Amino acid sequence: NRQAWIGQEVLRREDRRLLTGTATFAGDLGVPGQLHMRIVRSTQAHARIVSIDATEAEKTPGVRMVITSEHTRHLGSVLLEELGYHEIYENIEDFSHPVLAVDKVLYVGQPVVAVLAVDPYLAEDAAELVSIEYEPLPVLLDPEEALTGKVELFPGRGNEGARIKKAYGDIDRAFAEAEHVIRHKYVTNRHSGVPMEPRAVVVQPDPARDTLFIWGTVHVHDNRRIIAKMLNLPEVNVRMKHVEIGGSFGVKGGVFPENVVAAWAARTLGVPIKWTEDRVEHMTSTSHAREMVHKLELALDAEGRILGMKDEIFHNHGAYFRQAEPLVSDITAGIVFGPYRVPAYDATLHAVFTNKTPVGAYRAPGRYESTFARERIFDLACAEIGLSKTEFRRRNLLTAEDLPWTPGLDIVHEPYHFDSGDVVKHFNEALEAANFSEWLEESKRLRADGRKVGVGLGVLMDKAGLGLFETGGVEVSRAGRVTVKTGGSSVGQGIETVLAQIVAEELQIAPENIDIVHSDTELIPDGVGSWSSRSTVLAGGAARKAALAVVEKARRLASEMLEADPDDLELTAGSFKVKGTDQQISLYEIAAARDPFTARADNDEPGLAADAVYMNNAMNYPYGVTLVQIELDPDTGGHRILRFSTSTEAGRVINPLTTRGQIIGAAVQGIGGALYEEFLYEEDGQPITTSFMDYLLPSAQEMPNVDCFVTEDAKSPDNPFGAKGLGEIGIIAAGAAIASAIDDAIADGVHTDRLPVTPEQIFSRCQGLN
Amino acid sequence: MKPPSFDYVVADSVEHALRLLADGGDDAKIIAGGQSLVPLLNFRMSRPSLLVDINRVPGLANIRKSDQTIAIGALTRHAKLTTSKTISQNLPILSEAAAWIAHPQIRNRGTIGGSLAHADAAAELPVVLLALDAYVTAQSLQGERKIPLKELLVSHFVSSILPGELIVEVNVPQLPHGSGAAFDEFSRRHGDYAIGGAASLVTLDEQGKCSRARITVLGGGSTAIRCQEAENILIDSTLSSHDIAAAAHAAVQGLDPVPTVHGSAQYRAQVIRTMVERTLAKALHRARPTKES
Amino acid sequence: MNAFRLTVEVNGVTHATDVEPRRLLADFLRDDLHLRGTRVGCEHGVCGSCTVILDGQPVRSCTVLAVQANNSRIETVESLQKDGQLHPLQRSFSKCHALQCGFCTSGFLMTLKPLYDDEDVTLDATSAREAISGNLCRCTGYQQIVEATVDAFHCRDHND
């Protein structure tokens, strides 16, 4: 019996917690003697202040204290972000406010003053009574007029952002010797993750001062490292506790001003502090994303093959870096080329500042915005060259042949180098088999008195190792069960299930008996976290050589327990059959026997100096094509997405049932970005989309009756097991394909630039009939 | 979140309610449903000192076919409009119109009496009820008024209800017999506050001219709007894509809407325009009986 | 200045407690009736999670002051499970991976509950979508939920 578990559809381990409601979330936590923090936020977009009136706030009963800026610029550093630095140069700042500075305000929703009261009702009751008089300054909003820079945000100025540049060989000759040279600029919409759980933090101090407990949800819960350094009380003593999270999409990823204010205030009062975000707040305070300006250029010959490709990008970072370091901007500038033959290139990314909510990293950050413009310049190019988008992408995709194809673009640091180590294979048979699966041609064939069709491709910077390591640990027990410690984090995508399978496979124990513990920094003093579709080959790779450390620790230890040497039958139950077929020793009894007999019955080998797990220089790049067909009502602005199918090649799907969730779910978040979601600021500076009535989240009825999934496990990469990151591959080309279809269905020019596609824009067909 | 502090009471009777909030507050408010008041509280956009819960008062809950009209209690739930009588002539337009009001969860607690007194510019009910020529009885401590729907709707979020007084019941006249009623709206997602919508109702002359027509507009200004002159076109004239198109294209010329987030001014005028003719389409067909179907 | 005494039935257990009128039902059902099962996402009758059974009808625990619920039956997601055995709705939701994060699970489940318990109707993909539509999710999106609900209604009725 060699029961296999990886690749199998097994129902999630997380399911029952969430279904019954036994699972606790950050907002669910209660601690006796709690104080409830409410935050007085900005009402100006750009303003310096004189704030001294919390008098009637301080004097309403039930309120224990009101925290001003002067409390917190103290010690009271300003929000550091970490490695990925060089640095070039420099950093400060942003970081955010970073904590309430008693001088200037750089966006509506910025923390200025925190109150502390007994119940959250009384907390904001006192928050109203706080008065701050403002000097309104001029307001910056357009990324392009940020750097043509009058109206400077920082008085030190403090050039807006960081300028990233990457460019191969001889693009001067690649362009100069081209027949069709194509220039167009694209604009992406400002939108984010907007998960269902708003941000929430609970801090309990151990006033014995020794320590501090944080049931806050800080999204690398092993980034106590920041709070520690900031508060100067490091590094244990800041012991983080595990909580379930209601979705993040990287939008919650990192340290916020709220996190430190609470932690500081908790420490210096010896009193537990609780914080729970407004949705409204979330819309003006939680990290933004997606807003770019994509000037692009192409070099093409009479064949239609690529020769040269690129110009400048303007990433609008909002007002501040927020562990939203060039990281994403650096990634974006690395992969606006995707999985194509691109002889040369010229990135000049301008990460810039405006009076908006500080930009973090939304699901597939910088790659939704880039694979849009890239596929919106390719579609446009087919208009002049004259012939099909299908057979353009078809023969200048990614020659292989070529593979390994060390590019092709830069000067390749994505995010460091060198890459693209595209050792993973056949670029094309995906697109080929993806349309041989099976329609596309079948309703390009349309009697089409309705409307039309679209395409788009997405490669992914999706195992950001991180580099070198990731920790893991497996433990067998006296009670039948198995325990797995990991540096992973259940944002709700099924890590605790995937790892259980990985361990199940290697240990020959049902994934039911295995439990997984994460984000509890007392058990797990070191872990990396969960971002950039990574946690399987990294943390699952940790789980493997952990479970593989026990099998030796056990099988070796079992040969000593009976007297048979390490050869037997073949050895799994999980237990130990020597011979064929006398006797046996179970895997748990082995562990139960290693008690206080001079020892210990467990493993945790990742890692040491010269790390473990080892994933270094080159990450895997998964690639995928999205296929869409839309109908449109022209007398109004309506549309009904008739068909949808994202198909992505990624070696070794670990859990097919759950990966389907990660593909479909993401794809919808893409349609949300493509046709519904935009943060609208009024020309003076105030946010307009603050409620849910304004910001449009896709609902059940409007979505495609099915997103089809075409994944194949050809060409496993060489990081055993040969698997890929898949938690982002849904949204990548969701924007471009929708756009192409809309332009194909009208039909004028293939000339759409700005997302989203509002119903007002989409009667420019009233023009067509006129 | 976090609504302001207030005192709270449940009224026993229709004049008990009037009696208490009168001396209770210059700024005492009524509640009933909550789906508009309670959220206005979590946004701290309202500061009642006293809240009067009338949601538990006997009479105002039923539906009657009195005389040549139809009586509806003010506390009648949106859901009990999609169900069940429903009412006479039934479907009337309302079960077709209420089916747009947000979702079942909200429709389960939102009252007709609330939406009319709240009077959101984009509220689906008043738009319909104006096309039916509604009549709203409003009891007060002093006496009892009856106000037609035309004067009632003042502005967005403003009604002509005097402070203190209470909307008791809405009665709609049961129109003619065998007439056409339809309602359609456009919105990004099914159930959102619509960009543009229309409710058109046609009565056939059989011999088949048009005897009477009433037309209203969702989101033409600050309130529902009768297109009294666009109706004049249809009168005496028959069927026809053109008379329909001519009627619809002439209902929007007198309209200046508000923007911006979901659409611009002239934009909405053109969406409403296709809403009028489209409703007029099914405003026939439904007008066919003589039954035997 | 003003305290109010609640006499409410919650998931069977009747409670008597004094609460300030302004506390919302959601906050009351989480404190101190520590039934964290009910979850709060939006703040104005949209997110869905909010949703609870009030007197048989699904309403938002978030547009109702706790005080308005006096002398009424209330049921939350905690009340589905009956002696270890997950209520079939919960089973098919896991059988079809109808949930990844957890938030949009109280909301949908409680919306679907009275619909389930009453003998009609069938729920086909189209009518299934319309049913859950009152609840938002940012993870699935719905495809599997719609697939999950349908499955639940087949083992319900036609059932071998």
Ligand SMILES: Cc1cc2nc3c(=O)[nH]c(=O)nc-3n(C[C@H](O)[C@H](O)[C@H](O)COP(=O)(O)OP(=O)(O)OC[C@H]3O[C@@H](n4cnc5c(N)ncnc54)[C@H](O)[C@@H]3O)c2cc1C
């Ligand atoms: C087109 C449309 C879209 C909608 N969309 C949404 C949505 O997206 N989300 C949502 O949550 N809800 C929505 N609603 C519901 C809307 O809030 C309704 O007004 C609902 O009925 C609110 O409950 P209520 O008005 O009965 O009680 P409340 O909302 O408590 O009433 C609010 C106000 O009405 C007054 N009032 C109520 N009854 C009376 C009376 N008998 N006499 C005098 N004054 C009275 C009160 O003084 C109070 O100030 C929508 C409704 C419509 C028509």
Ligand SMILES: Nc1ccn([C@@H]2O[C@H](COP(=O)(O)OP(=O)(O)OC[C@H]3Oc4nc5nc(N)nc(O)c5nc4C(S)=C3S)[C@@H](O)[C@H]2O)c(=O)n1
């Ligand atoms: N059942 C699964 C789950 C994940 N994977 C893949 O294996 C890795 C393990 O996941 P993880 O490392 O956590 O991926 P990320 O750290 O990038 O996070 C997951 C991904 O997809 C997500 N899925 C989410 N789902 C829910 N319900 N809620 C969130 O907040 C989520 N947030 C995310 C975010 S953020 C991203 S980017 C990922 O590469 C994923 O593609 C898989 O094969 N099978």
Ligand code: FES
């Ligand atoms: S938060 Fe109360 S309904 Fe969404």
Ligand code: FES
């Ligand atoms: S809401 Fe995040 S998983 Fe459904």
Ligand SMILES: [Mo]
């Ligand atoms: Mo992410």
